[PDB]
């Protein structure tokens, strides 16, 4: 009947930002007011659309992307941003129309000694295009000499682990993000 936003937000496991998930949302009427009225979301940014007018609008393609980043990196999930997440992990277009939702998940994604299940890409030969996704693990060549599949000097594994710990500051605490894209293209 209604849109299954609950399965996105209430998911037990979340993806790393480099391998960010995505679900289609279509052929359903959504109750967005139950989401942007909840104080559990410390970050609820909507771009190119009034949040209180979401139910008065119909869209062609509505996607729900979810991943986990550190608190200091939620700033990069926004139109026209730069940084390791915006460039090498998850890029939003300048004409992006939708909402960005993020909440602190320290009690779920941290552990004493470090949670290593979440990673993010720290090196890449070029920036990503909007909504591109790269999941390669090729050794990144910083210098001029080729690496030949051996990690070392100027030869890095491209993915960095967060190592989430509960005693970290909120900037380095885990945050789960959900990006609702509202695209008004030419389609039924």
């Amino acid at each position, epitope marked *: 009947n209604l849109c299954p936003f609950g399965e996105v937000f209430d998911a037990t496991r979340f993806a790393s930002v480099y391998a960010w998930n995505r679900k289609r949302i279509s052929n359903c009427v959504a109750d967005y007011s139950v989401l942007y*009225n909840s*104080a559990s979301f410390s970050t609820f940014k909507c771009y190119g*659309v009034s949040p209180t007018k979401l139910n008065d609008l119909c869209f062609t393609n509505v996607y729900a992307d979810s991943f986990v980043i550190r608190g200091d990196e939620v*700033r990069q999930i926004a139109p026209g941003q730069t940084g390791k997440i915006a460039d090498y992990n998850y890029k939003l277009p300048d004409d992006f129309t939708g909402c960005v939702i993020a909440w602190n998940s320290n009690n779920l994604d941290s552990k004493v000694g470090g949670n290593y299940n979440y990673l993010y890409r720290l090196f890449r030969k070029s920036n990503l295009k909007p909504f591109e996704r790269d999941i390669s693990t090729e050794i990144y060549q910083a210098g001029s000499t080729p690496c030949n599949g051996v990690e070392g000097f100027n030869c890095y594994f491209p993915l960095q682990s967060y190592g989430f710990q509960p005693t970290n500051g*909120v*900037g380095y605490q885990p945050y789960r993000v959900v990006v609702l894209s509202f695209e008004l293209l030419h389609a039924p």
Partner: nanobody
Amino acid sequence: SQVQLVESGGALVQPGGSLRLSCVASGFTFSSFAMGWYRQAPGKECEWVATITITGGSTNYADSVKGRFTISRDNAKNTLYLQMNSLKPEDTAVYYCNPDPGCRGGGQGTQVTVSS
């Protein structure tokens, strides 16, 4: 970037005193964003204080400040407020406001000292 956040209203106050912090925001549609207050003690780490929704209809507060602090917004002025009553020495920190998490939102923050 374009985001600019100006916090103010802090001072040196005795315990039990009251204070009201302001945060004038610019560079983004303030009326379509959730807002949060964050603080950092000089030797400790940045921590979350309070959160207010887009419409201001609901709020949320850290346990150490619940009952004493109040967060409010005035979309007509692009300003976020934090009313700090019954100030305790544990509230001594630099306070930041930020639609994103943490103390690195780009603003200088406001200093609050509850010594005396």
